[PDB]
Amino acid sequence: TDLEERLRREEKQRQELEKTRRKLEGDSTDLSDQIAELQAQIAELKMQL
């Protein structure tokens, strides 16, 4: 019974980390796509310039 209560404590800490990890995963993947778009825009401006 005490182990079940203590076991739930780790679940709360994992939930707080999952929200931060999930947010970083989606943001990290979105940041990678922005680099490709920014690189393509630089080529269009550099070629025209």
Partner: protein, 49 residues
């Protein structure tokens, strides 16, 4: 030059649209691949019991 340049716009713009969808599909595959292990890990935990 104008006719040849116009033909490149339909191919250049078309290729960019396909590349954009490929990047989004590739990003979703990495997220699903990493998330796939999460479901298996959680499933293995419940299945272990």
């Amino acid at each position: 030059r104008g006719e040849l340049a116009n033909e490149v716009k339909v191919l250049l713009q078309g290729k960019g649209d396909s590349e954009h969808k490929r990047k989004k599909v590739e990003a979703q595959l990495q997220e699903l691949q990493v998330k796939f292990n999460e479901g298996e890990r959680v499933r293995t935990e419940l299945a272990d019991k």
